[PDB]
Amino acid sequence: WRSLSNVVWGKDLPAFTYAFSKTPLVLYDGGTTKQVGTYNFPVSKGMAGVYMSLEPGAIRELHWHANAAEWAYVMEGRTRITLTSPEGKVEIADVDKGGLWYFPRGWGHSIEGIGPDTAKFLLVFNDGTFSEGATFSVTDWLSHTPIAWVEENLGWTAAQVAQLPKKQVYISSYGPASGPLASATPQGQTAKIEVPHTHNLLGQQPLVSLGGNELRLASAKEFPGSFNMTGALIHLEPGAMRQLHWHPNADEWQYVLDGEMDLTVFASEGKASVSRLQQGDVGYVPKGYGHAIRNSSQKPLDIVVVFNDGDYQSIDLSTWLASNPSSVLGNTFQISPELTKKLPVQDTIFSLPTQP
Amino acid sequence: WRSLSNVVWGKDLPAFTYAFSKTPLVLYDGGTTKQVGTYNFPVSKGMAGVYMSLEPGAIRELHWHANAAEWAYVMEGRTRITLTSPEGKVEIADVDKGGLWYFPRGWGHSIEGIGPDTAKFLLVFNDGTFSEGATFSVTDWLSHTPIAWVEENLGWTAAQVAQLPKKQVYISSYGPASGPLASATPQGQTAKIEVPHTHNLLGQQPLVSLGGNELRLASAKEFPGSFNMTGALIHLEPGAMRQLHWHPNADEWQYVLDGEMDLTVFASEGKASVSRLQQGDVGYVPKGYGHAIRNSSQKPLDIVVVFNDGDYQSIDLSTWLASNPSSVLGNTFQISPELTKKLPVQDTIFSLPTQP
Amino acid sequence: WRSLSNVVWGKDLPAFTYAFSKTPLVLYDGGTTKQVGTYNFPVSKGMAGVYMSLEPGAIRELHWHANAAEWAYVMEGRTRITLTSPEGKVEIADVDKGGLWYFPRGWGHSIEGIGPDTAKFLLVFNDGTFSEGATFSVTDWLSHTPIAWVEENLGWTAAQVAQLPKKQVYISSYGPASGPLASATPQGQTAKIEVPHTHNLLGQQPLVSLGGNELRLASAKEFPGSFNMTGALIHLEPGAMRQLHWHPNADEWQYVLDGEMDLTVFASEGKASVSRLQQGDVGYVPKGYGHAIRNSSQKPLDIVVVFNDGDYQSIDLSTWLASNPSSVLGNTFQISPELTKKLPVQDTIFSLPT
Ligand code: NI
Ligand code: NI
Ligand code: NI
Ligand code: NI
Ligand code: NI
Ligand code: NI
């Protein structure tokens, strides 16, 4: 990738991509997981990412984490979530392929794979240090509380408390697998959360469409329950680009759903990087850094990108240059008036291949 | 206190209690004080606590501290406060036993003991590094300003300025003791603060009551002047329990007003603690940590707890488990369907010992 | 300067002033600049300051910086700015002597000197680590992107892209100089920003005026586009002072426009400083520290001060003492009832030489 400056790509910069596709899975009874955050991907301060799979009837047990909100995208299969708020209200809902959930920091929750095959999903947390090994587990909790107090709290005998787990379960396939949603009723009378905390992203109409390239955007305008986090699906045809831009207000976390992705990141001070991501790899663009995404392959590319702000803000280079008068542009770029007039006058968000 | 995990209580964790009852008082002319913060209680990052007493006519001099808001609970006696805002408005008020004040960050204030008894009160600051040795004193200020500028600022002669203190006074019993509230008028025409910054907590009816156990809560709903701090009084009868819960949004600072308190703290990653607090000792539960409080004694227990958020948010274990369906609970806890149905179906906030 | 305590001025404290007047300029083709922030002025954590000049037709190139909002005061001459928001709207405006601009964090912008004279202005950033060497330059950007992707994004050939700069331009005099404002139209159809992000500070009537001493204040009340920063102009006559006060909510950054300024700063724990600032020097008062400013010279003093909050909050000593009853004051200061009654009963903001 030649540049006008002949910059040494990546020099004096952290990695902006991580080979998450090669990270080994941790295996549980009915599920798998792996994660990427500042502990293995130092640039990724604003968000951490978790891959999880759950077989039918496998549950990610009831837990909470007050250090991070949890935004999710279901890649394959079907899940059911439960979510309990400090007002004592509950949301119990199916989330299918292409759907989202958002669990506010510290609200209690569970996730179950409901089949018929493997559920596979991404979890993105708005704390880059988040680790799935550091969540607050209800089974860990009750096995790390004095037995006599658990007895009193539950109205249970010692012999009943002795039947509870002795350590953090994390993922269970003990069972039973949950049944139809209409029968998934709280054991005790519980009012229902009314603001939706699940959402259908893949089923949205594209916010932007150009020559088969598509952007589907779920910010707080589309999904207000996710009040401080935004997600988008980008589909790029062979040769096409998401145009050069930056985000004034948010970091950007990226996962390649399928295909092969090229990312370039401009970091100021004459420093920049370019790298290729395979399916299942991760990218991270710090707030304010200039960047673009290109499909340099002969096959389609699909990515999910996540922002740690509920308001999607992008300034495209094309918009920026179109907004300025000729004199400012010619003086800035030190170019002829003739060439100045050929700078962008409109922003199409994507760029179609121009190479004949 | 046996547990299902046989966890070594306190292993790999900071102390969550501090033997504040044994901290020596610092003695002033008509007052005493002592304090606990990150400097001696490392876990206590969000809040620091100060004990202070003032004899009749003793004043904690005019001072300010822009690094911390100041929330107070008067344990004994009567105080008079003054509070001056950047709007140039003043609040002059009596605060008696069971009452609160809240001084916003950086607003100027004073506190006087009003007789015939000694005033004793707790001050909780929303910065764990706060120290009473590091406040901005008006007598320190004027003795550390060029004399010629103090003369000009006050319209005073050298001989008048020479009568001012040469250093921080801190606490003074020079006099005069203040008279009745209705005669405590500003020396110059000063508009009055209209939003109350004092409040009666002890005189509230309980928010929650069960079997003699009581919770009185002053959040910003009850006391909007204290916009980002909340306090509560908890009364526990012998053998009774404040149920297992966590706070999604706030740290919890605790002081034992009377009795003996048992506290358990669950910190995730299979780590937990349990300890006993005597009267005048202090506890601290970091945001999100699971906790419960038990009176294991034969005498009543009374505590004050303070949160560094104005919205009280608690998720009780009972609420959480009641909100979930049987399958999720049986799978998580790996227990029989019979036992699953005996999990909580309602939240009574407190739990009671075995009854006749 | 004697004090009641005989405090050693400056003992155990950082510098609260910086000899910015002596900082050397960095020279560009058509402009100059220098800066002061935590890297050379350690106390200055909340704000950094930049001096910049632009010759007629010289431009500070299109750039952005998402780490800092940019507040400006034009000291001499005339500028033209452009400002582009994430809504895809643009503001193109003239800012002359005494005027302000505020560029929100990460919004794209440019600044051009409009002739016939040199434009000289101050930029204050709400991040004390801000450096003009660390901005995101559009010419740096396009020279540090794969050429094939620039071709695609612009619809240009390799030979067209090859005419672009090979590195960060920073300041350019290549031209052309811009024409009249009414002719400075976006190359492509662009909606206009409607909330003003420029403002006339020097032209305001004083918020406070006493004996020739004046304070002009542009907080978010006067200039709502500058939503989280405030600027003020203070004029002090010989012998006059801005009274003792503190700010509960903001740090204060100061620049001496002309004259000679005395600053005192009280830092608690029996520590305080007093320093004299020359024209072009800089002061910084941390949030909550007590302070006062005095003109101890025989000539006028004019300063600009900037706060990293959009709501100007000041508690003057006089207001505070006037708000309290006699008993509280006499007990605090350990003075006679007679002297207690002579403490302040009103706040005139400035104090006059006796
Ligand atoms: Ni979770
Ligand atoms: Ni982006
Ligand atoms: Ni105080
Ligand atoms: Ni609690
Ligand atoms: Ni700038
Ligand atoms: Ni000031």
Q: Which residues are bridge partners to A206 per DSSP?
A: none
List CB contacts of B213: < 8 A, sequence separation 6 or more.
B234, B235, B236, B237, B240, B242, B350, B352
The stretches of chain B forming alpha helices (DSSP H) are 138-143, 147-154, 158-161, 317-322, 326-333, 337-340
CA-nearest of C74, C75, C72, C31 to C53 is C31
What value does the CA radius of gyration of chain B take, rounded to a whole number of Å?
23
Residue in the block written with tokens 């955007």: A217
CB contact under 8 A, B84 and C320: yes
Residue in the block written with tokens 């005033």: B119
Q: Is the dihedral of CA C285, C291, C296, C298 positive or negative?
A: positive
Q: H-helix or E-strand containing B119?
A: strand B119-125
Nearest-angstrom CA–CA distance, A231 and A214: 14
C214 is in an annotated binding site: no
**DSSP category for residue B134:** G
Collapsing DSSP states into helix, strand and coil, what is residue A140? helix
- Give B79 to chain C, closest Cα distance, Å: 13
Question: What are the angstrom distances between the C-alpha of A293 and each of A10, A264, C30, C49?
Answer: 16, 7, 36, 36
SS (H, E, C) chain C: CCCCCCCCCCCCCCCCEECHHHCCCEEECCEEEEEECCCCCCCCCCCEEEEEEECCCCEEEEEECCCCCEEEEEEECEEEEEEECCCCCEEEEEEECCEEEEECCCCEEEEEEECCCCEEEEEEECCCCCCHHHCEEHHHHHHCCCHHHHHHHHCCCHHHHCCCCCCCCCEECCCCCCCCHHHCCCCCCCCECCCCCEEECCCCCCCEEECCEEEEEECCCCCCCCCCCEEEEEEECCCCEEEEEECCCCCEEEEEEECCEEEEEECCCCCEEEEEECCCCEEEECCCCEEEEECCCCCCEEEEEEECCCCCCCEEHHHHHHCCCHHHHHHHHCCCHHHHCCCCCCCCCEECCC
A76 tagged catalytic: no
Q: Are residues C89 and C128 in the same domain?
A: yes
- Backbone interruptions in chain A following residues (C to N > 2.5 Å): none
DSSP secondary structure string, A189-224? --PBP-S--EEESTTSPPSEEETTEEEEEESTTT-T
List CB contacts of B18: < 8 A, sequence separation 6 or more.
B36, B40, B41, B44, B281, B282, B283, B284
Q: Distance, CA B10 to ligand 4 centroid (Å)?
A: 19
| Prior bond of B325 cis (ω within 30°) | no
Q: Are residues B65 and B124 in the same domain?
A: yes
B271, A144 Cβ separation under 8 angstroms: yes
Hey, what amino acid is at A204?
Q
DSSP secondary structure string, A228-292? T-EEEEEEE-TT-EEEEEE-SS--EEEEEEES-EEEEEE-STT-EEEEEE-TT-EEEE-TT-EEE
Q: Are residues B122 and B242 in the same domain?
A: no
Q: Are residues C32 and C162 in the same domain?
A: yes
Nearest-angstrom CA–CA distance, B150 and B139: 12
Q: Are residues B44 and B165 in the same domain?
A: yes
Nearest-angstrom CA–CA distance, A182 and A167: 32
Q: Distance, CA B109 to ligand 3 centroid (Å)?
A: 7
- All partners of chain B with 3 or more CB pairs under 8 angstroms: A, C
Domain boundary among C168, C200, C232: C200
Nearest-angstrom CA–CA distance, C260 and C238: 10
Nearest-angstrom CA–CA distance, A243 and A337: 24
Q: Is the dihedral of CA A300, A304, A305, A311 positive or negative?
A: positive
Interface-testing mutation among A94, A107, A152, A161, with chain B (most B C-beta atoms within 10 A) = A152
C76, C118 Cβ separation under 8 angstroms: yes
CA-nearest of A129, A3, A109, A157 to A68 is A129
Hey, what amino acid is at B140?
D
C202, C122 Cβ separation under 8 angstroms: no
In A, which residues are within 8 Å of B344 by CB distance?
Answer: 154, 187-188
CA-nearest of A123, A125, A122 to A47 is A125
Q: Which residues are bridge partners to B272 per DSSP?
A: B266
Question: What are the angstrom distances between the C-alpha of A199 and each of A71, A85, A103, A178, C147?
Answer: 11, 18, 12, 21, 39
- Give C113 to chain A, closest Cα distance, Å: 11
Please report which ligand is nearest the Cα atom of B131: 3
Q: Distance, CA A150 to ligand 1 centroid (Å)?
A: 24
CB contact under 8 A, A164 and B2: no
Portion 197-216 of A in contact with B at CB < 8 A: none
Domain boundary among A174, A200, A226: A200
Q: Is the dihedral of CA B22, B26, B27, B29 positive or negative?
A: negative
Specify the CATH number for the domain of residue A82.
Answer: 2.60.120.10
Q: Are residues C32 and C174 in the same domain?
A: yes
Strand-strand pairing, A208-210 and B70-76: unpaired
Per-residue b or e along A228-241, where b marks 16 or more CB atoms closer than 10 Å to that residue's CB: bbbbbbbbbbebbb
CB contact under 8 A, C184 and A336: no
Residue in the block written with tokens 């090994």: A133
Nearest-angstrom CA–CA distance, C13 and B313: 42
**DSSP category for residue B6:** -
Q: Are residues B2 and B101 in the same domain?
A: no
Q: Are residues A89 and A129 in the same domain?
A: yes
Nearest-angstrom CA–CA distance, C331 and A280: 71
Neighbours of ion ligand 6 (CB under 5 A): C 252
Instruction: Nearest by CB to B266, from A104, A145, A187: name it.
Output: A145
DSSP secondary structure string, B280-318? T-EEEE-TT-EEEEE--SSS-EEEEEEESSSS---EEHH
C63 tagged catalytic: yes
Q: What angle do CA C20, C26, C27 make, to 5 degrees?
A: 135
Q: Could you give phi then psi for residue B150, rounded to 5 degrees?
A: -65, -45
Q: Is the dihedral of CA A208, A214, A219, A221 positive or negative?
A: positive
A63 is in an annotated binding site: yes
> In chain B, how many H helices and how many E strands?
6, 26
CB contact under 8 A, B322 and A134: no
C222 is in an annotated binding site: no
B165, B139 Cβ separation under 8 angstroms: yes
Q: Are residues B3 and B84 in the same domain?
A: no
Nearest-angstrom CA–CA distance, A106 and A124: 15
B108, B62 Cβ separation under 8 angstroms: yes
Interface-testing mutation among B129, B152, B160, B190, with chain C (most C C-beta atoms within 10 A) = B152
The experimental method behind these coordinates is X-ray
SS (H, E, C) C114-164: ECCCCEEEEEEECCCCCCHHHCEEHHHHHHCCCHHHHHHHHCCCHHHHCCC
Nearest-angstrom CA–CA distance, C142 and C137: 9
Nearest-angstrom CA–CA distance, B63 and A180: 64
| Prior bond of A116 cis (ω within 30°) | yes
The size of the B-C interface in CB pairs under 8 A is 228
Length of chain A: 356
The size of the A-B interface in CB pairs under 8 A is 223
Domain boundary among C200, C234, C250: C200
Question: What are the angstrom distances between the C-alpha of C179 and each of B200, B277, C61, C110, C184?
Answer: 67, 77, 17, 15, 7
Q: Does C160 reach chain A within 8 Å, measured CB to CB?
A: yes
CA-nearest of C123, C119, C118, C128 to C102 is C123
Q: Distance, CA C252 to ligand 6 centroid (Å)?
A: 6
Q: Is the dihedral of CA C242, C244, C248, C252 positive or negative?
A: positive
Instruction: Nearest by CB to B185, from C288, C325, C331: name it.
Output: C325
A328, A67 Cβ separation under 8 angstroms: no
| Prior bond of A356 cis (ω within 30°) | no
Nearest-angstrom CA–CA distance, A208 and A215: 5
Q: Resolution of the experimental model in angstroms, please?
A: 1.6
Q: Distance, CA A148 to ligand 1 centroid (Å)?
A: 29
Chain A's closest residue to B272, CA to CA, is: A144
- Give C219 to chain B, closest Cα distance, Å: 15
**Hey, which residues of B are catalytic here?**
60, 63, 65, 70, 109, 132
C294, C241 Cβ separation under 8 angstroms: yes
CB contact under 8 A, A333 and C165: yes
B234, B302 Cβ separation under 8 angstroms: yes
Nearest-angstrom CA–CA distance, C276 and C331: 35
CB contact under 8 A, B322 and A186: yes
DSSP secondary structure string, B175-229? SPPP--GGG---SS--PBP-S--EEESTTSPPSEEETTEEEEEE-TTT-TTSTT-
Q: Are residues C175 and C209 in the same domain?
A: no
Hey, what amino acid is at A113?
G
- Give B86 to chain A, closest Cα distance, Å: 31
**DSSP category for residue B58:** -
Residue in the block written with tokens 């589309």: A222
Per the residue annotation, which of C55, C61, C65, C214 is the catalytic one?
Answer: C65
Collapsing DSSP states into helix, strand and coil, what is residue B331? helix
**DSSP category for residue A134:** G
Structure tokens that stand for C143 in this block: 């020279």
CB contact under 8 A, B163 and C339: yes
Q: Are residues C33 and C144 in the same domain?
A: yes
Nearest-angstrom CA–CA distance, B331 and B1: 27
B144 is in an annotated binding site: no
Collapsing DSSP states into helix, strand and coil, what is residue A120? strand
Structure tokens that stand for B35 in this block: 């304090």
Structure tokens that stand for C63 in this block: 């750039």
Portion 128-147 of C in contact with A at CB < 8 A: 133-147
Length of chain C: 354
Q: Give the range of the structural domain holding residue C78, as residue numbers without chain letter.
A: 24-200
CB contact under 8 A, B145 and C294: no
**DSSP category for residue B349:** S
C63 is in an annotated binding site: yes
Neighbours of ion ligand 3 (CB under 5 A): B 70
Portion 210-269 of B in contact with A at CB < 8 A: 241, 243-244, 246-249, 264, 266, 268-269
Q: Could you give phi then psi for residue B106, rounded to 5 degrees?
A: 85, -5
List CB contacts of B297: < 8 A, sequence separation 6 or more.
B238, B259, B260
CA-nearest of A6, A38, A5, A10 to A263 is A10
List CB contacts of B175: < 8 A, sequence separation 6 or more.
B57, C327, C330, C331
- Give A221 to chain B, closest Cα distance, Å: 25
Q: Is B272 exposed, middle or buried (0-12, 13-18, 19+ CB in 10 A)?
A: buried
Collapsing DSSP states into helix, strand and coil, what is residue A159? helix
Per-residue b or e along B130-153, where b marks 16 or more CB atoms closer than 10 Å to that residue's CB: bbbeebbbbbbbbbbbbbbbbbbb
C199 is in an annotated binding site: no
**DSSP category for residue B269:** T
Portion 331-350 of A in contact with B at CB < 8 A: none
Q: How many domains does chain A have?
A: 2
What value does the CA radius of gyration of chain A take, rounded to a whole number of Å?
23
In A, which residues are within 8 Å of C183 by CB distance?
Answer: 325
Strand-strand pairing, A99-103 and A70-76: antiparallel
Dihedral of CA atoms C283, C286, C288, C293 in degrees, nearest 10, equals -10
Interface-testing mutation among C230, C287, C331, C351, with chain B (most B C-beta atoms within 10 A) = C331
Helix, strand, coil percentages in chain B from 3-state DSSP, rounded to 5 = 15, 35, 50
CA-nearest of C30, C74, C26 to C176 is C30
Q: Are residues A229 and A145 in the same domain?
A: no
Nearest-angstrom CA–CA distance, B217 and B231: 6
Collapsing DSSP states into helix, strand and coil, what is residue B335? coil
Q: Does B325 reach chain A within 8 Å, measured CB to CB?
A: yes
- Give B263 to chain C, closest Cα distance, Å: 37
